[PDB]
């Protein structure tokens, strides 16, 4: 729920060093979708159901929605993602 | 043979009447997916999977061999006499490649060499080809 928000140690990425404290971030930002095959492919080949236009895509969504939160190592300040858990709420 | 004998047994092949006909279902391989027991049975041929390997550079405008192993050469000299031509000193090197298709002429080093000791000249040579070369004899190539 409202965790871990913490100082930890593991840093395993492009820029690292000894395990040092990082923090949680819940990074949310950036452009959304239509960066991948899809908008490009419906530029062309649009006649009457090509590709899987008709089918629902990106799977169905469930109650939760994983977690995001990059954990940046305070120090180098550069970090990587870990597995995401489906948290009901993050605070 | 067994196939030759067909008559004499009702139904040929799998014994049954109303036996195997168009089945199990689908055409060719059934859908690579689930079906109502039509086809499945956990697979992993493929896994990854888009048959064949291809590299865009790999093609025209791609690097090409020929490659030679430092085995044929040593086998070639000094142990047995071979191409008398292109022979000088204890030994020498030069084109002994099936194709002089260009962009090529490297010599790999595998097997036991120098042993000739041989000196070779060709396009770039692998590291494990300098050694077991430059060692007894051998050296720079195709500057």
């Amino acid at each position: 729920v409202n965790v871990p928000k913490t100082r930890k140690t593991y840093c395993k990425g492009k820029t690292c060093r000894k395990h040092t404290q990082h923090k949680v971030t819940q990074y949310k930002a950036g452009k959304a979708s239509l960066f991948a095959q899809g908008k490009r492919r419906y530029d062309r080949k649009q006649s009457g159901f090509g590709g899987q236009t008709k089918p629902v895509f990106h799977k169905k969504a469930k109650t939760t929605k994983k977690v995001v939160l990059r954990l940046e190592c305070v120090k180098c300040k550069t970090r990587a993602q870990l597995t995401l858990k489906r948290c009901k709420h993050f605070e | 043979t067994k196939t030759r004998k067909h008559r004499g047994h009702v139904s040929a092949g799998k014994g049954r009447i109303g036996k195997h006909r168009k089945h199990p279902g689908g055409r060719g391989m059934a859908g690579g997916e689930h079906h109502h027991r039509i086809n499945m049975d956990k697979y992993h041929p493929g896994y990854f999977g888009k048959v064949g390997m291809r590299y865009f550079h790999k093609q025209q405008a791609h690097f090409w061999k020929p490659v030679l192993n430092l085995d044929k050469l040593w086998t070639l000299i000094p142990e047995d006499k071979r191409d008398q031509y292109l022979k000088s000193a204890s030994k020498e090197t030069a084109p002994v490649i099936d194709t002089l298709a260009a962009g090529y002429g490297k010599i790999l080093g595998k097997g036991r060499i120098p042993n000739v000791p041989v000196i070779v000249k060709a396009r770039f040579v692998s590291k494990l080809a300098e050694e077991k070369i430059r060692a007894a004899g051998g050296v720079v190539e195709l500057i």
Partner: protein
């Protein structure tokens, strides 16, 4: 030599050309398919593509329709993509150009065509000229140029029918090496239609 009748026929809204265009097709309009003409509308282009005063040459206008569509609807079994289905959206591959050239030729059965191209038309139909030749004529079968469009019709026959022309032999082909794949080895037939 005939530059600006090329230059002029660019804008078609410039000045003099436009006025002639105001009074032109007024008469052409209210003139039906099949006409005929003493001279070509653009003298540079005729006498470019191939037109000279000489006997055995004839140039005709043609009108067409306007936009392209006009098509029947498919029967049932429409349900599907649909693939070949659709209605007013599809445009036909043949140009309202190629269509002008035949729909001429099938007016004058006797003669063939090196094809000119249109003058512009508005709110509806486009026009087109279209020179034709005549195969069994004299002076036609004289000048080396403007020969061989009549031998006498041994191979070339109903050119533009087959297709061999200008706009056709374009349309279903352009360029040469490169992008001539699934195009003219000779053409669409062979290298199954694209």
């Amino acid at each position: 030599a005939y530059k600006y009748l090329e230059e002029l026929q660019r804008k078609k809204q410039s000045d003099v050309l436009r006025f002639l265009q105001r009074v032109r097709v007024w008469e052409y309009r209210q003139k039906n398919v099949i006409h005929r003409a003493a001279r070509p509308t653009r003298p540079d282009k005729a006498r470019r593509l191939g037109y000279k005063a000489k006997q055995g040459f004839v140039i005709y206008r043609v009108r067409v329709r306007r936009g392209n569509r006009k098509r029947p609807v498919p029967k049932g079994a429409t349900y599907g993509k649909p693939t070949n289905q659709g209605v007013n959206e599809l445009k036909y591959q043949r140009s309202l150009r190629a269509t002008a050239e035949e729909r001429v030729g099938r007016r004058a059965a006797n003669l063939r065509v090196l094809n000119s191209y249109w003058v512009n038309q508005d709110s509806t139909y486009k026009y087109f000229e279209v020179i034709l030749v005549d195969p069994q004529h004299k002076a036609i079968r004289r000048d080396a140029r403007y020969n061989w469009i009549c031998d006498p019709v041994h191979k070339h026959r109903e050119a533009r029918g087959l297709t061999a022309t200008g706009k056709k032999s374009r349309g279903i082909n352009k360029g040469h090496k490169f992008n001539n794949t699934k195009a003219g080895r000779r053409k669409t037939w062979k290298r199954q239609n694209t």
